[PDB]
Amino acid sequence: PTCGAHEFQCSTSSCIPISWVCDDDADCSDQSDESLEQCGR
């Protein structure tokens, strides 16, 4: 399953927008938006 161009897809077919990644929040159930491979913290 692919979302739109303005959505970042974490896992399990639930996608959050590109403005919502790397911002110290849990917007996905797997915490892929604040992982070490994207933010690089």
Partner 1 sequence: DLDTHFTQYKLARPYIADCPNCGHSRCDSPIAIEEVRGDAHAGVIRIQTSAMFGLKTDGVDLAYMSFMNGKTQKSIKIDNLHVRTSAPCSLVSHHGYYILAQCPPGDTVTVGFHDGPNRHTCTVAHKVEFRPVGREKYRHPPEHGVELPCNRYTHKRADQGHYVEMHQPGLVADHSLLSIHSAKVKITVPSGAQVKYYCKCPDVRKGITSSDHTTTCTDVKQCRAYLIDNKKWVYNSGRLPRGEGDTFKGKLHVPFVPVKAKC
- Binding residues vs partner 1 (CB under 8 A): 19-25, 27
DSSP for 1-41, please give it: ----TTEEEEETTEEEEGGGSSSS---STT--TTSTTTT--
The partner in contact with residue 37, picked from Ca ion, partner 1, none with C-beta cut-offs of 5 to 8 angstroms by kind, is none
- Which of 9, 10, 14, 20 binds Ca ion (CB under 5 A)? It is 20
Q: How far is the CB of 5 from Ca ion (least distance, A)?
A: 18
Report the distance separating Cα 35 and Cα 2, nearest Å.
Answer: 21
Q: Please give the residue ranges that form the binding site for Ca ion (CB under 5 A).
A: 20, 23, 25, 27, 33
